[PDB]
């Protein structure tokens, strides 16, 4: 069984075309502000209710956001896709692997593998590094392949799923304004 970190509902929709027996873990203290976290969480809950998915919701709090910010802050000034995102994704995947170990899952993954903007080699390297640390296997898949991304777009539209326009953190929201 696999515990799959969930970044957002659109990428969850792409992912569920391929995976069938999973526990999902919505944990994203990198999403600010709270209103945006809740909007994204509610979209995930809408997908989970529609398809009867098993989703666990992680901690979101001032303390949790401060732990994330500490992990990325020395690279604030670098763009998206830089060492800042390496730190951010490792932070999220480390917590996911910890949860997988605690809940008895032998494997972990992330719906970030389905996101068209993310760097697959970077994510696979992070996942394998965390696998070696925790002893939970990282499951890699080109989750966009088999045309699954466009499959996720179609289901997002039909179900009326919120599709965000910035990665999630305050740095990415500023970079949106340019
Ligand atoms: S742009 Fe996305 S991956 Fe990069 S630090 Fe911000 S939330 Fe994390
Ligand atoms: Cl995302
Ligand atoms: Fe996503």
Resolution in A: 1.5
Strand partners, 24: 4, 55
Tokens of 47: 């997908």
Q: Supply the DSSP string of 114-164, one letter for each residue.
A: G-TTS-HHHHHHHHHHHHHHHS-EE----TTTTTHHHHHHHHHHHHT----
Neighbours of 64 (CB within 10 A): 16
Q: Are 30 and 88 in contact (CB under 8 A)?
A: yes
The conformation of residue 77, written as its DSSP 8-state character, comes to T
Q: Which of 117, 98, 128 shows the shortest CA–CA distance to 163?
A: 117
Closest ligand 1 atom to residue 171 Cα is 6
Q: How far is the CA of 37 from the centre of ligand 1 (A)?
A: 14
Which three-class secondary structure state does DSSP give residue 19?
coil
Count how many domains the chain has.
1
Count of helices and strands (H, E) across the chain? 7, 5
Cβ of 171 closer than 6 Å to ligand 1, yes or no, is yes
Q: Are 90 and 129 in contact (CB under 8 A)?
A: yes
**Range(s) of the domain holding residue 57:** 2-177
Q: What is the CATH number of the domain that holds 114?
A: 3.40.50.620
Tokens of 156: 């997002």
Strand partners, 23: 3
Which three-class secondary structure state does DSSP give residue 55?
strand
Backbone torsions φ then ψ of 35, nearest 5 degrees? -60, -35
Method: X-ray
């Amino acid at each position: 069984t696999v515990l799959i970190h969930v970044c957002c509902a659109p990428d969850l929709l792409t992912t569920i075309f391929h995976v069938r027996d999973a526990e999902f873990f919505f944990y994203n203290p990198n999403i600010q502000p709270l209103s945006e976290y809740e909007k994204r969480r509610e979209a995930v809950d809408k997908v989970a209710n529609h398809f009867s998915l098993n989703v666990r919701y992680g901690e979101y709090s001032t303390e949790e956001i401060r732990k994330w910010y500490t992990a990325v802050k020395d690279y604030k000034d670098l763009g998206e896709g830089s060492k800042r995102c390496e730190r951010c994704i490792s932070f999220l995947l480390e917590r996911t692997a910890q949860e997988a170990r605690k809940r008895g899952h032998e494997s972990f993954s992330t719906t970030l593998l389905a996101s068209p903007r993310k760097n697959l080699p970077m994510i696979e390297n992070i996942g394998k590094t965390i696998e070696e640390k925790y002893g939970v296997k990282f499951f890699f898949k080109n989750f966009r392949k088999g045309g699954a991304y466009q499959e996720g777009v179609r289901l997002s539209k039909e179900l009326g799923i919120y599709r965000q326009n910035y990665c999630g953190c305050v740095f990415s929201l500023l970079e949106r304004r340019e």
